[PDB]
From a paper:
Sialin, a member of the solute carrier 17 (SLC17) transporter family, is unique in its ability to transport not only sialic acid using a pH-driven mechanism, but also transport mono and diacidic neurotransmitters, such as glutamate and N-acetylaspartylglutamate (NAAG), into synaptic vesicles via a membrane potential-driven mechanism. Sialin (SLC17A5) belongs to the solute carrier 17 (SLC17) transporter subfamily that includes nine related transmembrane major facility superfamily (MFS) transporters, all of which are dedicated to anion transport, including the vesicular glutamate transporters 1-3 (VGLUT1–3) and a vesicular nucleotide transporter (VNUT). Sialin adopts a classical MFS fold consisting of 12 transmembrane helices (TMs) with two pseudo-symmetric domains: N-domain (TMs 1-6) and C-domain (TMs 7-12). The Sialin structures in both the lumen-open and cytosol-open conformations reveal a solvent-accessible cavity, which forms the substrate translocation pathway, at the center of the interface between the N-domain and C-domain.
Moreover, we determined the cryo-EM structure of the SialinS61A in complex with Fab10B8 at 3.2-Å resolution. The structure of SialinS61A is in a lumen-open state. The interaction between Arg57 and Arg168 is disrupted, instead, Arg168 forms the salt bridge with Glu171, which is consistent with our observation on SialinR168K. These findings support our hypothesis of the hydrophilic interaction network in the luminal leaflet to modulate the conformational change of Sialin. Indeed, the S61A and R168K mutations confine Sialin in the lumen-open state, indicating the importance of these residues in regulating the conformation of Sialin. To functionally test these interactions, we mutated Ser61, Tyr306, Leu309 and Tyr335 to alanine individually. As a result, the sialic acid transport activity was considerably reduced, indicating that these residues play critical roles in the transport cycle. The lumen-open structure reveals that the hydrophilic interactions between Arg195 on TM5 and Gln273 on the cytosolic helix, Ser196 on TM5 and Arg353 on TM8, Lys197 on TM5 and Asp350 on TM8 seal the substrate translocation pathway from the cytosolic space.
Numbering used by the authors: 34 to 70, 99 to 489
């Protein structure tokens, strides 16, 4: 039944991430319409910092967000993070008028508010998803970001065409509040707290989670930081984020500067890879859960297979993108194929935090994001320093580096990953 309580939560989280990512993306396309050459005379560096200061706040509140979510539950953290994002987005037109400093402060506040949503959602699923249904539920929850980017890219441009650029922020921000009103009303942080959950569904979920939750009184920080299986996930996530920062920022820039294709202006062709990623995310979660449920594959084997696919497969196409030459059509094809194969990581390492320690998945995902958000802020300078002459060979070297990092991460995860609850997560 589609209207079951846990899938209702999954759909609501899907739309929450859709809204948050649409809010995040629409700035990148409203900016080009408001900058000069009233219009604001911000150069390339000022625009880059306006865009990138979000992550300097996004990084900070990952581990604290996970810890607080494990202590009190994720409902309020997620709801208020997304509400803060929306409300602060509503003020972007004013902050732009005060000046660069106020706007960078606003973006940093958005990042701080938004840092807790992912660890909070993991800590929320640690109480809602039965072990043999995590792949479906988490995939449905996190495909919202992909669909949000897909819908935000063209619709914001349409709004700017028919309305002033401020209405983009107004529209998405008010939709954020209208979603928060549903989140406050329809969702609870645990099945025992749910107001409408049927008796047998609660019994089913609690019975499924009965022997995986922890009896411990306090977080095992030392075991968490000492466990090799966690560092396997960290190494996988860092490599994945580096590879996809490359794929979705540098490769479009490669097409812009070397091939002169200007994909950023086309719009729809830019959203195509995200649509493919959304569809593959959902279907690879479905297939990954079926493999564990019906065919009786070991969880670790499924994680290994899907991580190897979703990491190594994109590497080959990313490397090929440097050899395609003047044909930008096949460059777009490789971008789309790589971003589509990227969906398997939604059932690969991206879920393994719950697998190795469900009771502390919030903290584990907080640590993993704290490590994996670094590439999104170190890549700009690396690319700037690796392509001084801006020729095909330098971009080929950049793609070689990205593919090498991706393959090393995939191999490390394959070697050192685990798919069963660690003993340090069960009892003192």
């Amino acid at each position: 039944v589609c209207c079951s309580a846990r899938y209702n939560l999954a759909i609501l989280a899907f739309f929450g991430f859709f809204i948050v990512y649409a809010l995040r993306v629409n700035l990148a396309v409203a900016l080009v319409d408001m900058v000069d050459s009233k219009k604001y005379q911000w150069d390339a560096e000022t625009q880059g910092w306006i865009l990138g200061s979000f992550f300097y706040g996004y990084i900070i509140t990952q581990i604290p967000g996970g810890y607080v979510a494990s202590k009190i539950g994720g409902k309020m953290l997620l709801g208020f993070g997304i509400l803060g994002t929306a409300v602060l987005t509503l003020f972007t037109p004013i902050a732009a008028d005060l000046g660069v400093g106020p706007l960078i402060v606003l973006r940093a506040l958005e990042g701080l508010g938004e840092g807790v949503t992912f660890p909070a959602m993991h800590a929320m699923w640690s109480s809602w998803a039965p072990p043999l249904e995590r792949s479906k539920l988490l995939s449905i929850s996190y495909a919202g970001a992909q669909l949000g980017t897909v819908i935000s890219l063209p619709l914001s441009g349409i709004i700017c065409y028919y309305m002033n650029w401020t209405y983009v922020f107004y529209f998405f921000g008010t939709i954020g509040i209208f979603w928060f009103l549903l989140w406050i009303w329809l969702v609870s942080d645990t099945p025992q707290k749910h107001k409408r959950i049927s008796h047998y569904e609660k019994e089913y979920i609690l019975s499924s989670l009965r022997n995986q939750l922890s009896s411990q009184k306090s977080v095992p920080w030392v075991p968490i930081l000492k466990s090799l299986p966690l560092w396997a996930i960290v190494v996988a996530h860092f490599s994945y984020n580096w590879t996809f920062y490359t794929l979705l920022t540098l490769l479009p820039t490669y097409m812009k500067e070397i091939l002169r294709f200007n994909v950023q202006e086309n719009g729809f062709l830019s959203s195509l890879p995200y649509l493919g990623s959304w569809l593959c995310m959902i279907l690879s979660g479905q297939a990954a859960d079926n493999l564990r449920a019906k065919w009786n594959f070991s969880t670790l084997c499924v994680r290994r297979i899907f991580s190897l696919i979703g990491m190594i497969g994109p590497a080959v196409f990313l490397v090929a993108a440097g050899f395609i030459g003047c044909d930008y059509s096949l460059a777009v094809a490789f971008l789309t194929i790589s971003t589509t194969l990227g969906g398997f990581c939604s059932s690969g390492f991206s879920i393994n935090h719950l697998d190795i320690a469900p009771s502390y998945a919030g903290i584990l995902l907080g640590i993993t994001n704290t490590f994996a958000t670094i590439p999104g802020m170190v890549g700009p300078v690396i690319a700037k320093s690796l392509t001084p002459d801006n020729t095909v060979g330098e971009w080929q070297t950049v793609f070689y580096i990205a593919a090498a990092i991706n393959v090393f991460g995939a191999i490390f995860f394959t070697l050192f990953a685990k798919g069963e609850v660690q003993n340090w997560a069960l009892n003192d």
